[PDB]
Subunit: 393 residues, 4 copies
Amino acid sequence: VQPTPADHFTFGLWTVGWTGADPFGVATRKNLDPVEAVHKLAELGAYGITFHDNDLIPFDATEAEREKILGDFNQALKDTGLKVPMVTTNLFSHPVFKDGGFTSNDRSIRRFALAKVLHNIDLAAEMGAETFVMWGGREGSEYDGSKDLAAALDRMREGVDTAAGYIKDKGYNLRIALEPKPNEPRGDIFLPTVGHGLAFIEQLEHGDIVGLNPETGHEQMAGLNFTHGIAQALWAEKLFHIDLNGQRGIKYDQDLVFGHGDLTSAFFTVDLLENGFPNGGPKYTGPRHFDYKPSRTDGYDGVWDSAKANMSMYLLLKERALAFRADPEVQEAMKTSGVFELGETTLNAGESAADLMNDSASFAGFDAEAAAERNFAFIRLNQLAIEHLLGSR
Amino acid sequence: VQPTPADHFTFGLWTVGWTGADPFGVATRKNLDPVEAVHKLAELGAYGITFHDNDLIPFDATEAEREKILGDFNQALKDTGLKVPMVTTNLFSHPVFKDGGFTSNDRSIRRFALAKVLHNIDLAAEMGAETFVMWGGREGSEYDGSKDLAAALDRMREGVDTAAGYIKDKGYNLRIALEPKPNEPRGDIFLPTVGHGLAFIEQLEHGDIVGLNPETGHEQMAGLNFTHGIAQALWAEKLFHIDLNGQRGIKYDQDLVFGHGDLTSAFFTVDLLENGFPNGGPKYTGPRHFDYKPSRTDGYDGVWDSAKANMSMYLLLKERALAFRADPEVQEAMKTSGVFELGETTLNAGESAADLMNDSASFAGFDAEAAAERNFAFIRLNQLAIEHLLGSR
Amino acid sequence: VQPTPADHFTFGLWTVGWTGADPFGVATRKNLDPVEAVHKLAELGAYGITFHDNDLIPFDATEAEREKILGDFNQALKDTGLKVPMVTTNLFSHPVFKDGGFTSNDRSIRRFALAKVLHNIDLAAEMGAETFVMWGGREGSEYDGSKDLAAALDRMREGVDTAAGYIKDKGYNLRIALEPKPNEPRGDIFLPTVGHGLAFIEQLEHGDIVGLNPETGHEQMAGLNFTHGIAQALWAEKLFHIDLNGQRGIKYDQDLVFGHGDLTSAFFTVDLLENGFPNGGPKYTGPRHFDYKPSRTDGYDGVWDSAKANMSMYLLLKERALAFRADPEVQEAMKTSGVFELGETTLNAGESAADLMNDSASFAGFDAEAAAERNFAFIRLNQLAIEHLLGSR
Amino acid sequence: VQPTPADHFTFGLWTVGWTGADPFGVATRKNLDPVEAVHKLAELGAYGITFHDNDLIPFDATEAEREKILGDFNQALKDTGLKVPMVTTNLFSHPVFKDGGFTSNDRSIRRFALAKVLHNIDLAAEMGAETFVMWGGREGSEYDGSKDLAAALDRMREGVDTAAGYIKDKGYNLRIALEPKPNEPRGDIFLPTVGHGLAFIEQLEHGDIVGLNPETGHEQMAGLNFTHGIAQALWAEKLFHIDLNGQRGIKYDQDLVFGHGDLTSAFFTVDLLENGFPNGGPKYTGPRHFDYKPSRTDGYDGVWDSAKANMSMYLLLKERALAFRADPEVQEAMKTSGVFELGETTLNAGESAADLMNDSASFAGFDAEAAAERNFAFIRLNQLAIEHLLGSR
Ligand SMILES: [Zn+2]
Ligand SMILES: [Zn+2]
Ligand SMILES: [Zn+2]
Ligand SMILES: [Zn+2]
Ligand SMILES: [Zn+2]
Ligand SMILES: [Zn+2]
Ligand SMILES: [Zn+2]
Ligand SMILES: [Zn+2]
């Protein structure tokens, strides 16, 4: 397994550049030069790089400074051929954002936040990005009376719809991807799961260019099944981008390497990205992006190790996932279990409610006890999947 | 605090009639006669009663049997004056439903399930119910390859839209309320939280008469904030019914008395039901329904005790919640914290994206460090809330 | 694969005999005859079978039925060669144990529960069981004031010390093993984790013959590291038995097949049982017992499928865990990371606290900043275990 | 309210001095001078202050700065009367402790960590602290093969037994108290709960002077009952100190004010510290320490607000918990439910295991079905605690 740019593996600057500072300690690694991030990742097999405005350009940078930094970064990009498919904004690190950007209680903060996003849409568009991700990490509260909850959503809506109107007006080839997280840094974050993100989008004036950016560890922090959540996002055609990593349980955001958390769940996500749905349906085509953090115990040899571990893990899972579905035994098991019968509509062509209620065979004389005897054999289909995952098959 | 029918407290037959059978043991109480459930609840202060088709009418009941049971129940209702505001279907107890009703892999089961719902819509409508609740408790899986996930949602949609077309066609004054649960009895249940329910509704052909039935312990089983979740349901105008109870943590569905779980969260839910949003917004008006189970350690004196504890808890919380918002000190704290500033739109009337980006004051010359100095004083507003909850104020 | 009697795969009667009644439904399978259970198990390659008193002998059986049932049971054991390595008592299904057995608030139920155990101790000895397990499933509460928490631990101590004392008194060659569970069926169960169980054994009079029976799923219900918890049980020399199964997350006790829950943790669990510790130390040499339940969606073909899969999964994992430790690149990765170095004592032979008093070479003249650059390379080390697990290396 | 020095409210320097840097952001508050910290605390009514070595004396400070800093510190203590009841060491912020202190894989870092502790023991004695706390925050791993799990417990034992042995050697009037935490900053921390900590102390050489320092939030991060866990610590006679705070759910360590997390559990926690056990037994008589952190959204007015609220909340709860136990209806509800009956021994004075051997009056002729009808009335009993807590009774 060796990644090629054809694989479409993307990494954030903040991922391999994460310096190690956590809540109980200081950084354990020196800052990463962006030029070096670009060059290193291009030699590993990366397709592209992604960043937050302040990963690159300091908050306080003068114009001369900004210009140099950008000339350095664009240079690096030209030299290596790396694409910039997604750009995001930092609305969580400066003290000004302690109560949120878009949903701050303070109105002047709300406007600075939105100003900071619009300017960043411009940059994103100069960089050639197709996706604009929003992670509202400071939107929310520790306490239940701190917010007017209906007003928190109107403020959110105002922000996101102003950003979208501006894309439409400028003619930029950008789509917005919202990224859910249930908690941390706030005790409760607004629009905590894929479900809440998808709902909110339907109340937006310009929701057609607004979709999701689910992260594997984020949905697992609320104990949900990542594979089910992206399946609903795909089903509604709102899966615009995806962040892969690992999480080992309901706790702080670990941001481990993809496959370093729940393995079987990783296998099944790769099967859904690569094979689509058993009966047909939309398929995901964008970047396979890694929003992870190299453990702080490791030095720089560890950082490029981890980066490479992400693309390896994925490729290994993919090989198993493709062998899994190509196995005849696995296809037989699938049929037995009624994985293909689920895809047939319940009603017959032009049969209505009334006609169904009246079909005697379907209700009044249905032999419920007899139908209850089917052996779905779900245990056996899961066993076959694990056996292909362990490559013992 | 004494409940009156004006309070709109509703109870399910299955709640006070829960016999005690759990996964590790048999029933500890004798079955409850429905006539007696009706009469008892009317003397406690209940407004109405609710049930599942098989709580009342056995699965296997002959027509003579069904007719008697219904004559007994309707009698009881006439005598006491109890209303039947919601009716639901049991698609989880018979063995036939082991893989789901609507999303079973087996197609004949899917049709029986839907047949069983349509017939039940008829009954619901004869009983005078305004709400038809669906709890898809067996829809989902233990294993990730057991389902074609896109096909699971199409099947769900087919069922729910056939039920809704039939209401519209019959002219019945019914609305469908979906009820989320993340897990149990299945390892993962489809449409696990309020978020996922609200999303799904937007893909329905007839989603205008389809809304939610959130349960306090269900959202807490995924660790979310119940108060935030119903605030998004209210904001989208999709809060059709609500199930109140208590849950003490992420574990099995406890179904404790309302207030017997997370107290502060209960206080804040009552504040949202009773006071609405601080800046104005939709308000909830339906039944205040209790879907709880009297602990199995208690005998029948315990059952009516628990029933009464539900309405008491709520009334006590309500008195505190109304005193809380009426306190001048609390209103001052609210202003200070910017609870009312959140309600002012970010942009000025007819100010666009472009005009905002260009306002110098809003971005280029915004003094971020200075704005970061505001003391939101959220700790102090939470302290005042707790002090009103403990009635020490 | 191919399990053989020397593998020491023991299975309980309640596992394959689990008919499928959960909280929201009735059994989906017909009762399993015990003689049938013995023959099928033996033919799959099991070494032994375990049971709860009431699993074999009805709570109501007369003396005449006890001996008839035992007759056929002993004959089957005889005809097949299964051993009976562990026995346990049912102190949770009958409504009389609704507040517990040993810690029941009612004294006459405490006596009845203790009496039931004493007699089950005589049957255990009779069968040749080396271990007598205690799962206190109903010891706990839903409410914090339901119990005197000190007296609940005094009544638990009394029961376990009376039973232990009776084993010593009759000279049975039996050990007691407590089985922790954090909740379900009680809201909170006493001695909820391995730690708590371990701590508790140290306050008994007859502690010497009391140890633990940790279960994968149950520590995973508190979000804990199952391998870390068994390590501590083993390190303490209290790992008397083990229950293997699968759990996906903090939720109800799933009791899935071993390997169908957290797969990487199962990998490392098998590594500790089979290889023990990297530097040398204690080893677990008792039986590998499966405490699981066949999914209720599947017929009897799933039941025997599910029992074979337990066994397969443990041997596939065993295989990959033997190749992993044997691999010279892993052994070297291990050396780089300091695994063997953790094995050296901190203090030099003869060094005192004053001597070291941090020595400086160890304190004053120590270069903290230089020691901090060490790359532990834990990420690379984790990547080698996963490729070994995926069958890749 | 009105806290006074006899209340024994102790606060750490890092709590009110917590500037607000979390994982996604920088500090939102200016550094708090220690002399200032002492004066403000004393004027609020605190009895004492606790600190980590590096909280007061920089990791780099020279000998000359240590003594200057200690000079002013002792003077402030002097001028105000605060005592210094507990001292602890920082073994987690400096990058050198990235794999731990005592269980670091690197031997030279194990020595450096132990040396740091030994010297901090001499400062503790000097200050008059009675307790020396140990929070092993970096002892653990992200990955299961990063450690030899047996050697990690041997290296932890070595460190605590060397430190204890040195206390005994110098004749300091000091006790060691371990502080459990299940995770964060490590993915898995060793001795993650009260049980584990308790079990671990029993394998030490110098166990007699080692006990625990449980923290509300930290057992709540594993979903456990904090009152149940302190009960067991107390019952074991190992409850040497206590850390009080608030946590809403399984997520990152929130460190909220005591009472702003699980309010009913806080109620019952205060009932156990203040009233002890219903039937009589051990009592906790040390200090009431607050290990919390003022929300980062709030300025310095919130910091002193948040410190007063800890104290208020504990006295409001204390008040309601004294009225609850004193209430004659509660005392009678208690009798009905069997709380006093749990206090009686199971066996009669002189009864042997053979004698009882279940006696029958206790086994054979026992009417299990009749004993099962007992109404324990735990629901009514819970309803009386909540109305006592809501200020209603
Ligand atoms: Zn992400
Ligand atoms: Zn993340
Ligand atoms: Zn409900
Ligand atoms: Zn429920
Ligand atoms: Zn279990
Ligand atoms: Zn078990
Ligand atoms: Zn903490
Ligand atoms: Zn603490």
